[PDB]
Amino acid sequence: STGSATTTPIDSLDDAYITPVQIGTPAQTLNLDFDTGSSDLWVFSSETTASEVDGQTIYTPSKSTTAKLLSGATWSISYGDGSSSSGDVYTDTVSVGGLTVTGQAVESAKKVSSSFTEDSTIDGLLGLAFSTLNTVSPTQQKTFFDNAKASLDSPVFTADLGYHAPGTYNFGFIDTTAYTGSITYTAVSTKQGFWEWTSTGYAVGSGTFKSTSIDGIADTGTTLLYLPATVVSAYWAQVSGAKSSSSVGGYVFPCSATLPSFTFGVGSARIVIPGDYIDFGPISTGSSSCFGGIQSSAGIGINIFGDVALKAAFVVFNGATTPTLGFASK
Numbered sequence: 001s002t003g004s005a006t007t008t009p010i011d012s013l014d015d016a017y018i019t020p021v022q023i024g025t026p027a028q029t030l031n032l033d034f035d036t037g038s039s040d041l042w043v044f045s046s047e048t049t050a051s052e053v054d055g056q057t058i059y060t061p062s063k064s065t066t067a068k069l070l071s072g073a074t075w076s077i078s079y080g081d082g083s084s085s086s087g088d089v090y091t092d093t094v095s096v097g098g099l100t101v102t103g104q105a106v107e108s109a110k111k112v113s114s115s116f117t118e119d120s121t122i123d124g125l126l127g128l129a130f131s132t133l134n135t136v137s138p139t140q141q142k143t144f145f146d147n148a149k150a151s152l153d154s155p156v157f158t159a160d161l162g163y164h165a166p167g168t169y170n171f172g173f174i175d176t177t178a179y180t181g182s183i184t185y186t187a188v189s190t191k192q193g194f195w196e197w198t199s200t201g202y203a204v205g206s207g208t209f210k211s212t213s214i215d216g217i218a219d220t221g222t223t224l225l226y227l228p229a230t231v232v233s234a235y236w237a238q239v240s241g242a243k244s245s246s247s248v249g250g251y252v253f254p255c256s257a258t259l260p261s262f263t264f265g266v267g268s269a270r271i272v273i274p275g276d277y278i279d280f281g282p283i284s285t286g287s288s289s290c291f292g293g294i295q296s297s298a299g300i301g302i303n304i305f306g307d308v309a310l311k312a313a314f315v316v317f318n319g320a321t322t323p324t325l326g327f328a329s330k
Contacts, residue, residue, distance in 0.1 A: 001151045002172035003099025007034065009164065010121040013280055014307060015223050017161060018121060019169055022095040023106060024064030030057050030123035034169055035221030036159070036195055036317065037304075039133035039143050040077050041094070042085055042107035043124035044116075052112050055120030061108065067092045075107045075135045080222065080300065083115040089136055094144060096126075099171050101148050105134075105141035125221070128157065128317065133193035145171070145319060155319045159220055160330070161311035163277055179314035179328035184269035188323045192302075194219070195317060197325050199305075200267060202227075204235050205260030209270070216303030218310060218317070218325055224280075225262075225273070226297035226304040235262055235294050242292070248283050251292040255282060262294060264309060266327040273312040 007019040018031040023043070030043055044053060046060040061067035067090045076086035087110035094104040109124070116122065127134070131142045149155045152172035160178050161167040168178070189196045194217040203209040214227065232251065236242040238260050242253035253259070259275030278293035293308040316326030 001099055001148075002153055002170070003095075003097035003148075004168060004170045005097030006166050007161065007169055008166045009162065010119070012164070014161075014164060014311065016119075016122065017167070017220070017307070018123075019096070019126070021126060023059055024061070024092050025066040026064075027095070028057075028059055028064065030059060031121065032124050032126040033122050033221060034126045034128055034159075035219070036128040037217060037219035037221045038077065038079065038125065039127040039129045039131055039193065040075060040107050040135055041105065041124070041126045041144055042075065042077070042087070042109055044112070045087070045108040047087060048109045049111055052117045054117050057123045059106065059108065059124075061090045061092065061106075064092055066102075067106075070105060070136075070139075073105075073136050073139060073141075075137070077135045080304075081115070083113045085109045085112040085116060087111065089141070096144065096171065097169070099148055099152075101144055104144055104147055105136060107136065128220070129195065130190050130193045132190070148172075149319055157317050157319070159310060159315045159317065161220065161307055163274075163311050167311070174316060179330045181329055183314070183316060183326040183328040184266045185316070185318070185324045185326045186266055188325050190323060194302075195323070195325055196302075200265030202231055202265065203263040203270075204238050205275075207238075209263065209265070211265075214264075214303055216297075216305050218305050218315060220307065220310060222304045222306030223308070224304075224306050225294045225308040226300055226306065227294060228303065229296045229298045232294055232296045235260070236292065244296075248289070248291070250295045252283060252289045253292055255288045255290040257290070264305075269327065271309070271313045271327055271329060273309060277308055277312060
């Protein structure tokens with residue numbers, strides 16, 4: 001089997017992407033944030049504290065003939081940005097882009113933090129990291145991908161995120177029309193539960209490539225590119241007036257600037273992030289200070305190849321017995 005679903009930016013900045021997902025019988029379609037940096041499929045629901053719901057579409061398990069309470073199971077998750085959610089668990093039928101999993105754990109939120117409430121466009125998350133990170137207790141649950149894997153034509157999914165435009169998540173096949181040149185595959189460590197890999201270096205604009213190992217995660221659920229302070233300083237030094245602002249919370253730059261590209265290495269291959277992808281616009285409406293899309297990872301504890309990086313590539317998440325990651329230009 002295979003699946004193919006379009007993913008759409010939630011706003012004009014590509015802060016996140018939503019993908020429609022069918023849950024239950026008859027189908028309830030919710031728009032979920034596919035997150036290769038976590039491993040829980042959770043939804044706003046009929047159980048979510050009323051004051052914490054503001055425009056989201058909810059899953060109502062009592063209206064699904066295939067929903068079953070997973071008795072005694074609870075979940076609770078905290079994300080890198082400090083947001084969180086928790087609740088109980090149902091199993092139900094879940095379909096993405098025509099690919100169906102029966103008995104998928106659907107984690108129903110009883111509580112969500114303010115950032116989730118405030119984002120009316122995101123009805124929940126669909127985790128695509130390794131199932132060892134799943135938070136369900138006392139019986140850990142598998143991700144949608146893990147459950148689908150054995151049925152897939154090939155044990156892979158691909159992320160093809162758009163820059164200010166829709167893109168695609170495919171399951172079970174590689175669309176050879178969706179990228180240019182060849183795909184370069186690189187080793188993955190699953191030791192921390194992430195799609196963790198080592199970039200071979202970087203360049204700023206038309207500058208020379210610096211060969212240096214940068215361990216990080218491929219994370220579709222993180223907006224920006226978070227890299228070591230040395231790398232980030234070298235990038236922003238090429239933008240007149242750019243500075244790190246503790247009050248704003250990262251590097252800002254004059255909105256009058258033209259940003260240089262940023263290249264990262266994948267083996268001997270190179271992915272180029274155009275400068276425009278690094279512009280996140282005014283820090284507040286009307287401001288002439290703009291927020292940068294490359295930020296320091298210092299204090300996170302890991303480097304993160306988030307959407308800024310991933311949307312410059314066609315990315316293969318290869319879930320074979322020994323997982324790997326592939327990157328192609330597009």
